[PDB]
Amino acid sequence: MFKFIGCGSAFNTRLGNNSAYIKEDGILFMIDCGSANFDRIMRSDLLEGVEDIVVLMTHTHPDHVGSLGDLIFYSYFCMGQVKVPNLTVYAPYDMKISKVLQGMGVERECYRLIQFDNSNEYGFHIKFQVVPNRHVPELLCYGYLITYKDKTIYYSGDANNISPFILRMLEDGEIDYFYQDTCQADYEGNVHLSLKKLSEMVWANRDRVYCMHLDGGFNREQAEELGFNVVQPSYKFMI
Amino acid sequence: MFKFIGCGSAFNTRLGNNSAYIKEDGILFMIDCGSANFDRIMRSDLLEGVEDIVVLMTHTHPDHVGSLGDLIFYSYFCMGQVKVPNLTVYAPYDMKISKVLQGMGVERECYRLIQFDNSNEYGFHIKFQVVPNRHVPELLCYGYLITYKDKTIYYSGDANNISPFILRMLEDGEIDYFYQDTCQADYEGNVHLSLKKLSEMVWANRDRVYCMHLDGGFNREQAEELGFNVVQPSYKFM
Numbered sequence: 189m190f191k192f193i194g195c196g197s198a199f200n201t202r203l204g205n206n207s208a209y210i211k212e213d214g215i216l217f218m219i220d221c222g223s224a225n226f227d228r229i230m231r232s233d234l235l236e237g238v239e240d241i242v243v244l245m246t247h248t249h250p251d252h253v254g255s256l257g258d259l260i261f262y263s264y265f266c267m268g269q270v271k272v273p274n275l276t277v278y279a280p281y282d283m284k285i286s287k288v289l290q291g292m293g294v295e296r297e298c299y300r301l302i303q304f305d306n307s308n309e310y311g312f313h314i315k316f317q318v319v320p321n322r323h324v325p326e327l328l329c330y331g332y333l334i335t336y337k338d339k340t341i342y343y344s345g346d347a348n349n350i351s352p353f354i355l356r357m358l359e360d361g362e363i364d365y366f367y368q369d370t371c372q373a374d375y376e377g378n379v380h381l382s383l384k385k386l387s388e389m390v391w392a393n394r395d396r397v398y399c400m401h402l403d404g405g406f407n408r409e410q411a412e413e414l415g416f417n418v419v420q421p422s423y424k425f426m427i
Numbered sequence: 428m429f430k431f432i433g434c435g436s437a438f439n440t441r442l443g444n445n446s447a448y449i450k451e452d453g454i455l456f457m458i459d460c461g462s463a464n465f466d467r468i469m470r471s472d473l474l475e476g477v478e479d480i481v482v483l484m485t486h487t488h489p490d491h492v493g494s495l496g497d498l499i500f501y502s503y504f505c506m507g508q509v510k511v512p513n514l515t516v517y518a519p520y521d522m523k524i525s526k527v528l529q530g531m532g533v534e535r536e537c538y539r540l541i542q543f544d545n546s547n548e549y550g551f552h553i554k555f556q557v558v559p560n561r562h563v564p565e566l567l568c569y570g571y572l573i574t575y576k577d578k579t580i581y582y583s584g585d586a587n588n589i590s591p592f593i594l595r596m597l598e599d600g601e602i603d604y605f606y607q608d609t610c611q612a613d614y615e616g617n618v619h620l621s622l623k624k625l626s627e628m629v630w631a632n633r634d635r636v637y638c639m640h641l642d643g644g645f646n647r648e649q650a651e652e653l654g655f656n657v658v659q660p661s662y663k664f665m
């Protein structure tokens with residue numbers, strides 16, 4: 189169901205920062221807004237015809253929150269009714285997203301913030317359920333089970349593992365689209381899931397698995413040979 | 428003395444975020460590192476041959492700090508000796524830059540931090556003196572008087588005023604390069620200095636004044652008619 193504003197790892201900025209979106213009925217829904225991505229959005233026509241923006245947060249690394257404040261300010265000052273919020277951030281309460289934004293001078297008057305512990309929701313309807321994922325110990329990091337147009341989508345966020353319960357859902361056909369942070373590098377303490385490990389953990393329904401957050405060394409040919417899909421920025425974001 | 432990685436206002440991202448630099452003797456010195464700019468830097472050869480990075484901070488708006496953490500991580504993990512700090516951040520103590528960086532998961536082990544109240548410094552030699560400036564009520568914001576290769580540089584940061592002592596220095600010929608946040612809009616409570624106000628405040632040495640942080644509406648032809656210079660990204664970034 190998802191298209192991508194960006195799909196690279198933090199240093200692979202030619203693909204943009206990893207961020208998926210849905211645009212429908214004047215609503216722009218996106219997961220994360222990394223440092224590189226506000227400029228990509230502004231150079232595209234993605235915001236044309238958009239009445240309301242919704243941003244769902246996975247964690248606050250710079251390649252996931254670094255330009256959210258730019259987008260908040262732009263939507264507040266320049267979109268629709270000037271100086272009225274038209275962007276809603278959704279985040280787990282424990283992430284303390286407002287404190288991160290306030291550190292950059294982004295105050296609550298500029299956006300709407302909906303926080304939750306377990307789940308929440310936003311003709312456009314979307315639901316999401318938190319899946320805490322391990323990534324770095326410095327930050328609380330999340331993926332999500334997302335329900336949209338009667339499809340079930342798993343979106344890992346940045347993650348170096350997959351819960352056995354989520355794997356079982358995928359194996360049993362209960363996840364229609366499975367977006368997974370995957371990297372080529374394979375090493376102890378990896379903060380991302382290697383392609384090798386992904387191939388060891390998923391045998392069934394590989395055709396529903398989409399590798400994202402791709403590092404510069406990522407071997408797309410090998411990923412496809414194994415039966416996985418590899419995401420790329422949407423054609424809107426490619427020359 | 429300065430070249431620019433970017434020179435736009437927050438929404439004018441085709442010019443990049445406002446950030447000046449010097450690259451000399453394996454040292455890359457930059458003022459701020461806004462969200463848009465790590466990608467600009469990575470697409471260029473700016474980091475080629477660089478041994479040490481120094482970032483001086485004016486304030487922590489997203490278009491000034493949003494990708495500093497990306498650059499810290501890249502320099503720590505990918506430049507030179509892997510997992511040894513490559514980058515030194517300079518900031519006034521009151522800015523609390525480490526708390527901002529910690530919020531994005533950027534820990535103190537990944538960079539060197541030098542904080543000060545009044546002044547500090549870094550073959551390559553550079554000195555800076557803090558100039559507190561008004562900009563927004565949410566943040567403590569600063570410009571700087573910078574000494575480099577026997578030239579005196581004023582760099583406003585984001586600012587909606589010029590301190591009288593800095594104006595006098597400019598009028599008296601004591602500032603060689605005067606970089607000023609300037610915008611076209613002119614309104615009560617403006618968080619930047621309008622071109623109109625700049626023209627009312629500065630009469631002598633306008634030829635040493637460089638308008639930066641340019642908004643999408645900025646009238647470069649009018650600024651040049653008034654005798655000011657207009658900054659642009661260095662050709663490396665165009």
Ligand SMILES: [Zn+2]
Nearest residue numbers: 198249251346
């Ligand atoms: Zn990431």
Ligand SMILES: [Zn+2]
Nearest residue numbers: 247249323346
């Ligand atoms: Zn991350």
Ligand SMILES: [Zn+2]
Nearest residue numbers: 437488490585
């Ligand atoms: Zn600014």
Ligand SMILES: [Zn+2]
Nearest residue numbers: 486488562585
């Ligand atoms: Zn600012």
